[PDB]
């Protein structure tokens with residue numbers, strides 16, 4: 001099913017690549033990424049959202065600030081809290097601070113979230129139909145830290161111990177690559193100097209490589 005290629009960046013759904021710095025907040029960038037996309041779907045307005053808001057404020061939902069967290073917990077915080085502040089209003093500091101949420105600066109909401117079935121087919125359908133999707137991958141590899149170009153494939157990757165929250169913004173195939181030629185287009189949060197301007201093409205339809213389909217979800221708006 002679905003189109004053979006999808007890239008939500010071409011439609012105005014995606015903010016530029018951000019940089020989490022020396023703070024374990026990948027989950028918060030994945031979540032703001034998915035929420036940015038869904039708010040844009042809903043309203044036609046793209047507004048960068050505050051990861052710091054999530055880092056400082058979503059402890060009650062289970063998140064652990066710069067020590068780690070879950071995208072679904074972030075989506076839950078937005079729902080419980082009744083809002084989330086803009087990036088511009090509540091800027092990213094890459095450390096933990098007092099929660100400074102101000103509803104006057106809220107620019108987004110959600111009514112909960114949807115967990116996608118653990119299959120690449122379902123992830124494809126979600127990406128094609130919904131917009132950018134929050135996912136977690138096994139990025140615990142020198143090959144990933146030093147990734148620069150090409151479709152990422154790591155023979156020692158696992159689908160069971162994912163450690164890194166990122167955002168799938170589309171998928172395609174490389175006229176070049178063909179044998180195992182499909183990729184997921186993944187927005188990372190490590191700045192533009194990493195990978196391909198901050199993005200990585202992850203191997204697609206190679207039996208759920210790196211667990212990309214195992215922890216996929218999106219916020220309901």
Ligand SMILES: *CC(=O)[C@H](Cc1ccc(OC(C)(C)C)cc1)NC(=O)[C@H](Cc1ccccc1)NC(=O)OCc1ccccc1
Nearest residue numbers: 024025026027062068069070136139140162163164165215
């Ligand atoms: C991606 C992150 O910043 C954090 C912490 C982290 C930093 C660096 C690494 O190493 C490299 C190699 C990836 C650079 C690893 C981790 N990771 C998370 O917050 C992680 C993301 C995730 C993983 C699976 C599914 C969804 C999100 N979440 C996490 O570790 O959660 C642990 C946890 C469990 C229960 C309650 C709170 C937190």
